Amino acid sequence: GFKQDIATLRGDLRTYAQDIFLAFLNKYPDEKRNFKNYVGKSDQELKSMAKFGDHTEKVFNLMMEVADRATDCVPLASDASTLVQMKQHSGLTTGNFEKLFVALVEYMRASGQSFDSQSWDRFGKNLVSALSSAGMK
Ligand code: HEM
Ligand SMILES: Oc1ccc(Br)cc1Br
Numbered sequence: 044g045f046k047q048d049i050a051t052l053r054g055d056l057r058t059y060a061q062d063i064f065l066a067f068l069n070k071y072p073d074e075k076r077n078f079k080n081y082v083g084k085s086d087q088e089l090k091s092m093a094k095f096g097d098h099t100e101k102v103f104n105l106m107m108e109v110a111d112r113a114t115d116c117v118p119l120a121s122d123a124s125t126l127v128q129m130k131q132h133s134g135l136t137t138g139n140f141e142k143l144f145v146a147l148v149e150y151m152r153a154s155g156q157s158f159d160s161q162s163w164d165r166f167g168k169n170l171v172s173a174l175s176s177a178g179m180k
Contacts, residue, residue, distance in 0.1 A: 045116060045162040048151075053107050057096055060103035061089070067146035074142065077135075109170070116166040123173035136180045137171050144171070 052059045065086060068075050075082060081089055089095040109122040126132060126140075144167030151158035 044159045045110070045166065048158050048163065049107055049110050051156070051158070052103070056103055056107070057100050060099035061096070063103070063147055063150050064099045065089075066150040067143050070146045070149070071142050074139065077139075110166060113166060113169075116162050116169055118166070118170050118173055120173055120177065123170060124177040127174055127177045127179045137174050140171055140174060140179075141167070144168075 068078075068081075080092075080094060084092070105125075109118050109126075112119050112122060144164065147167065148160050148164045151160040151163060
């Protein structure tokens with residue numbers, strides 16, 4: 044289930060972070076315009092950039108922290124607020140986050156591992172609602 048998934052993901056955090064972020068950019072290429080440092084670079088090029096490894100690790104680590112603090116896939120309002128107020132998130136809307144979770148859920152279903160993809164879908168939906176309540180457009 045959801046808690047075990049956090050353990051699986053945290054166990055190989057960088058690899059899963061890179062794979063999910065790439066699944067997201069592959070599914071939604073226009074989203075890459077938010078990441079100027081990664082434009083025009085192949086997957087192997089990105090995986091060779093310490094900047095890409097560091098960014099994806101730290102993003103995914105915070106996502107696992109938020110997931111771990113949730114109760115039955117309902118995140119803390121304060122975690123949503125952190126995400127809304129981050130300067131690096133200026134201009135984004137709930138749609139960007141919904142697309143991330145669409146790609147995340149799709150990745151999990153295609154992986155062949157036993158992720159609880161329905162719980163991650165619900166966690167994403169609850170997090171998006173929390174992001175809107177905390178003021179995200
Ligand atoms: C649960 C979802 C998310 C979490 C937990 C999260 C967390 C973070 C964290 C911790 C950072 C700082 C990482 C660093 O040091 O570079 C960051 C930066 C950033 N995030 Fe998010 N993020 C999420 C979703 C998104 C989405 C959906 C987008 C846009 C599609 C986005 C766009 C960005 C950008 C543009 C930066 C700055 C990149 C940079 O400075 O190099 N994030 N995010
Ligand atoms: O910028 C990102 C890095 C890692 C992940 Br997983 C998702 C996003 Br959006």
